[PDB]
Amino acid sequence: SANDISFNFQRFNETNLILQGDASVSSSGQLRLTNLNDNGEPTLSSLGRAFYSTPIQIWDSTTGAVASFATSFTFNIRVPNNAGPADGLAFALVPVGSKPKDRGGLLGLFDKAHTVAVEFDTLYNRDWDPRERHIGIDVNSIKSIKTTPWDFVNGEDAEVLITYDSSTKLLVASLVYPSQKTSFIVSDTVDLKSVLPEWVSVGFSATSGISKGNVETNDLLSWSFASKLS
Amino acid sequence: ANDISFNFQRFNETNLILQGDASVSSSGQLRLTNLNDNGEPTLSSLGRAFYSTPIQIWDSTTGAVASFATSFTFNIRVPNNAGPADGLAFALVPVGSKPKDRGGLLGLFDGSDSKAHTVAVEFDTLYNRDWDPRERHIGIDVNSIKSIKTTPWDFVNGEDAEVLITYDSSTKLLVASLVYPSQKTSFIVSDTVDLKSVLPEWVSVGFSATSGISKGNVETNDLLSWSFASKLS
Amino acid sequence: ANDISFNFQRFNETNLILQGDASVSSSGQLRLTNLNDNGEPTLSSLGRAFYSTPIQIWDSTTGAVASFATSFTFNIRVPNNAGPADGLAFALVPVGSKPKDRGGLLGLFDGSDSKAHTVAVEFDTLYNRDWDPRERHIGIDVNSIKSIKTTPWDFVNGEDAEVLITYDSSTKLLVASLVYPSQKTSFIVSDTVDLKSVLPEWVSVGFSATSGISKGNVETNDLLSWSFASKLS
Amino acid sequence: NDISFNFQRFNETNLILQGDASVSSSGQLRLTNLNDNGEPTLSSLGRAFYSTPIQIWDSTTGAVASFATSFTFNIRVPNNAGPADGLAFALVPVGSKPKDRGGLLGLFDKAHTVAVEFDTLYNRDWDPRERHIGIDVNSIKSIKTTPWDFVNGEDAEVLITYDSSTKLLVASLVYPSQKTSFIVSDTVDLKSVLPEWVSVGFSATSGISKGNVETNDLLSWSFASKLS
Ligand SMILES: *[C@@H]1O[C@H](CO)[C@@H](O[C@@H]2O[C@H](CO)[C@@H](O[C@@H]3O[C@H](CO[C@H]4O[C@H](CO[C@H]5O[C@H](CO)[C@@H](O)[C@H](O)[C@@H]5O[C@H]5O[C@H](CO)[C@@H](O)[C@H](O)[C@@H]5O)[C@@H](O)[C@H](O[C@H]5O[C@H](CO)[C@@H](O)[C@H](O)[C@@H]5O)[C@@H]4O)[C@@H](O)[C@H](O[C@H]4O[C@H](CO)[C@@H](O)[C@H](O)[C@@H]4O)[C@@H]3O)[C@H](O)[C@H]2NC(C)=O)[C@H](O)[C@H]1NC(C)=O
Ligand SMILES: *[C@@H]1O[C@H](CO)[C@@H](O[C@@H]2O[C@H](CO)[C@@H](O[C@@H]3O[C@H](CO[C@H]4O[C@H](CO[C@H]5O[C@H](CO)[C@@H](O)[C@H](O)[C@@H]5O[C@H]5O[C@H](CO)[C@@H](O)[C@H](O)[C@@H]5O)[C@@H](O)[C@H](O)[C@@H]4O)[C@@H](O)[C@H](O)[C@@H]3O)[C@H](O)[C@H]2NC(C)=O)[C@H](O)[C@H]1NC(C)=O
Ligand SMILES: *[C@@H]1O[C@H](CO)[C@@H](O[C@@H]2O[C@H](CO)[C@@H](O)[C@H](O)[C@H]2NC(C)=O)[C@H](O)[C@H]1NC(C)=O
Ligand SMILES: *[C@@H]1O[C@H](CO)[C@@H](O[C@@H]2O[C@H](CO)[C@@H](O)[C@H](O)[C@H]2NC(C)=O)[C@H](O)[C@H]1NC(C)=O
Ligand SMILES: CCCCCC
Ligand SMILES: CCCCCC
Ligand SMILES: CCCCCC
Ligand SMILES: CCCCCC
Ligand SMILES: CCCCCC
Ligand SMILES: [Ca+2]
Ligand SMILES: [Ca+2]
Ligand SMILES: [Ca+2]
Ligand SMILES: [Ca+2]
Ligand SMILES: [Mn+2]
Ligand SMILES: [Mn+2]
Ligand SMILES: [Mn+2]
Ligand SMILES: [Mn+2]
């Protein structure tokens, strides 16, 4: 029963995605999670999500097996002139068929949750966030089990790698800016069996801010995923 | 680029589109055609099953064509005092394609004058005199149940068959091989296929099978494992 | 579990052990056998070439046996008014083994009473009356030039042949296939081989080829590309 | 010209061992010397390379490899000692011999060498003060470092990647036991520093002075390269 799935997209197409809320694929093959107006500028209170169109098996109830996975992606978050960024984007494992949740600081993921995410959090929410912008590991809550500071760079491609090792239960997320040569990493244990259903949708969720001048694009340029169910 | 790879040692309904009689058993076998509650195959059965996300086979903007490889183990079992019919096939079909004719048309083709935009590799257990060669055969099927090429296949009742199908977009060569690990026998067929001119840009990949329409011509059409990989140049 | 994988679209001497007449050309072809000053293959030529790191095929502590898959493109060219001889083989051999007999023994086996501890897949272009089947063939060779199993091979002069060899350690099935993309012809042979009982734990993987010993029986033995993968379960 | 390997246990048969390096009966790559009590010894120097060279770039085509390596290491310091000197993953010229002991990690003394060091001993002439992960381009004086909170005797998991399209080299380390993680990244022009073909592997040294010593054990190693 040793199952695997791997995919690699250097360009996106709608045909193998479930798009929700504001998410679209551009004619240039970019996954734009949040809404652009007719002038190509990001709008307020935007919420988009996008998932690979086939569910991934994360664990097996008969055998007690848990999947290991790795994903990499390139994102571009651009803030217009005279604006600050909000709210961020996340890679997520969510229940099959789940619909977007609350927007703004809850990143379309949160509002019995069964969601694990890695957030790239561009806006301080004083009720649960650390002060600086951060990479967070989110287990059924917007209040991360662990964060690491992230020195956000406006409009420059970020390259992410997230891995999950089912033998150590360690989830590790890293981001590098090839242009700035800066890099960030966070790691914590997450018991996927105890939090997620057996099958999940994998993909992304992103929101723009709810108030004028708190806004950003949330673009994915490339995405690779691989899972192995031991 | 748009690459995809999967490996199923056990099947689950969650990542398949099942059509007609196809089911996944509680043991994780993909049973393409109908079994009664005693595990005996029924007449005039038709099932298909596809991976639930479409595969990009070629790109009209760039002219790129995918290369792919698939392997699978199948088990065709014929009840005592029957011969086998009709066979099973691995296929690339248009997204949202519905099953076609039963019996000798393997749920992939019909007697219509419309092109199926379907490429398949058939494991054909029943002679249809209007298009088949006389012996049981592996065929390469391009928009027709009349294979562009076949090779004889010495069918073995109820024994696991291991298949490998490869498509090289640089030579346009499609190659299908089958081995019976129990009998140590092997078969192979090869032909060129221009995927761009026959398939749409995106396809569903999976299987189609039919049982015979007449008493004493019947078989199971079980898949035990399936691996697929595609790479769009 | 341990693995090794490599893929060469062009050869370089830096990652090969070359023996006898084997050379790598400035165009990146692995030429196993020699050319005379007239640009024709010479008589009694013998070359071998191995990946320069040994592969672990099995483990005596764990009882694990490797599964492997290899693919390669070869070009055998015969001068006008000649027939081909003797052939080329993919082989697993003991680490540090030296070339064996010329001609019909393909540089892999000799007339000694010692076990060569060698498994090969031969592409045999010359009938040897003491042990061969009548037609040219793909053979599976276990410690002897007298193949445990062969399949006829319709040799085509000077056309690229594409080979795939797989070994599944769970069924012990070794399968070899050849296709000519130009002719769309294909051949396959399969048999079980217990690698633990024949090979040492570590082997060198690569090729062996010979040209004929008598005028008018001669060929080139060129490798154009080679991919290998092993997985020690 | 692509190459991939994965060793969950080591064997001598596919390695070039230099100086003190050995493979144990348990299949661990021990880069530095152990005494009869299984304790690490002073002034040890060991290297170990995959026994086939890797093609890193091609002068005819201008192609540069992308690569990725992962490995688990165990650095153990005896009681009443501190650690020295560290271990490194390196790309070195084919047939390269070990260089200087101690703080030079067996790699330096233009040695046409690129390395990622896990540096357990402050050398005031070139190091930053805290233990660190460094990117080393032809010098023991890293082009870039990041602090590393060394944990005595706990398994460390490393990932190093090199993307030839961005020229970005990234190294990361995690302690699964402590849930701590570290990362450093810089651009490296491999064409201008390495030969076309290299040996890939490890170099490690134990300290030269009493009470500065460590084991330098590799437990698993995966490597993959792709010459575009
Ligand atoms: C392919 O993969 C699939 C999917 O993974 C495999 O299918 C699974 O197989 C396992 C093992 O056989 C099944 O486990 C068994 O489940 C039953 C309970 O079944 C009923 O409840 C299911 C759960 O419902 C809750 O959770 C879901 C989300 O996870 C939620 O949507 C529901 O609304 C519900 O929520 C409620 O409960 C929660 C806590 O439990 C609360 O928080 C929440 O707020 C609510 O109160 C449900 O999915 C299931 O429905 C499926 O199956 C029915 C048929 O029964 C079908 O009609 C439906 O369409 C669904 O498909 C049911 O309603 C449980 O009783 C079993 O327990 C026995 O075994 C355990 C294990 O040892 C023992 O501890 C027990 O004592 C007992 O003896 C068992 O756990 C699982 O139900 C099933 N899931 C699905 C989605 O089908 C499939 O087998 C794979 N195929 C192959 C070939 O391998
Ligand atoms: C990586 O993978 C590799 C390859 O698979 C593994 O390596 C292989 O490991 C196996 C298992 O250890 C080795 O084979 C064994 O080697 C044993 C030693 O072989 C040598 O020594 C033998 C004995 O030598 C003594 O006796 C002879 C007389 O018979 C004298 O001539 C000689 O001088 C010695 O005499 C002295 O000691 C004896 C002690 O018995 C006294 O009696 C005398 O008084 C005197 O003092 C010798 O016979 C033999 O020919 C060798 O020289 C051997 O015992 C055993 O049976 C077995 O063969 C492989 O050698 C090794 N292979 C390679 C390629 O190196 C490795 O394990 C793996 N590593 C991991 C981590 O898994
Ligand atoms: C993704 O692929 C789809 C399908 O090939 C493309 O959508 C088709 O585009 C053609 C060309 O304009 C239309 O005539 C079809 O009707 C489209 N089909 C659908 C379902 O709308 C699409 O262009 C590709 N997307 C990107 C971003 O490349
Ligand atoms: C195999 O690789 C070797 C080592 O790079 C190539 O030889 C070198 O080629 C470069 C560029 O052509 C020269 O700058 C070096 O001086 C060569 N060194 C030698 C010949 O030792 C060699 O050409 C490659 N072989 C093939 C068949 O491509
Ligand atoms: C380290 C995570 C495993 C990646 C393969 C699914
Ligand atoms: C994804 C594999 C390509 C097919 C040619 C052997
Ligand atoms: C190493 C992969 C080979 C498996 C044999 C089919
Ligand atoms: C399907 C390709 C086989 C050659 C080695 C991966
Ligand atoms: C061979 C894979 C390279 C990946 C480096 C980012
Ligand atoms: Ca926030
Ligand atoms: Ca028929
Ligand atoms: Ca012969
Ligand atoms: Ca130092
Ligand atoms: Mn946050
Ligand atoms: Mn037919
Ligand atoms: Mn022969
Ligand atoms: Mn240092």
Author numbering:
A (entry chain BBB): 2 to 112, 117 to 235
B (entry chain AAA), C (entry chain CCC): 3 to 235
D (entry chain DDD): 4 to 112, 117 to 235
Paper text:
In this work, we present the production of a recombinant lectin from Tepary bean (rTBL-1) by using P. pastoris engineering, its biochemical characterization, crystallographic structure, and an analysis of its specificity for cancer-type glycans. The taxa inferred by the evolutionary analysis showed that TBL-1 belongs to the group of phytohemagglutinins of the Phaseolus genus; more specifically, the data suggest that TBL-1 is actually a homologue of PHA:L, a leucoagglutinin from Phaseolus vulgaris, present in four of the five different populations of PHA heterotetramers (E4, E3L, E2L2, EL3, and L4). The absence or the elongation of the glycosylation, if produced in other heterologous expression systems, could affect the overall folding and functionality of the protein. rTBL-1 recognizes β1-6 branched N-glycans, which are overrepresented in several types of cancer, including colon cancer.
The crystal space group was found to be P1, and the asymmetric unit contained an rTBL-1 homo-tetramer composed of two antiparallel dimers. Each monomer was composed of 15 antiparallel β-strands arranged in the classical β-sandwich or jellyroll fold observed for legume lectins such as in the case of their homologous PHA-E, PHA-L, SBA, PNA, ConA, and LOL, among others. The jellyroll fold consists of (1) a “back-sheet” with six β-strands, (2) a concave seven-stranded “front-sheet”, and (3) two “stranded-top” connecting sheets. The tetramer was obtained from the back-to-back association of both dimers stabilized through interactions between the β-strands 10 (amino acids 186–194) of the corresponding chains. Two divalent cations, calcium Ca2+ and manganese Mn2+, are attached to each protomer through coordination with Asp131, Glu129, Asp139, His144, Leu133, and Asn135 as well as two structural water molecules per ion. They are located at the top of the “front sheet” in the vicinity of the predicted carbohydrate binding site and are indispensable for lectin activity. In accordance with the mass spectrometry data, we observed electron density that corresponds to the N-glycosylation site at Asn19. This permitted to build the proximal and the distal GlcNAc of the common core of N-glycans in all chains as well as six and four additional residues belonging to the antennas of chains A and D, respectively. No structural evidence was found to suggest that the binding pockets could be affected by the presence and/or size of this posttranslational modification.
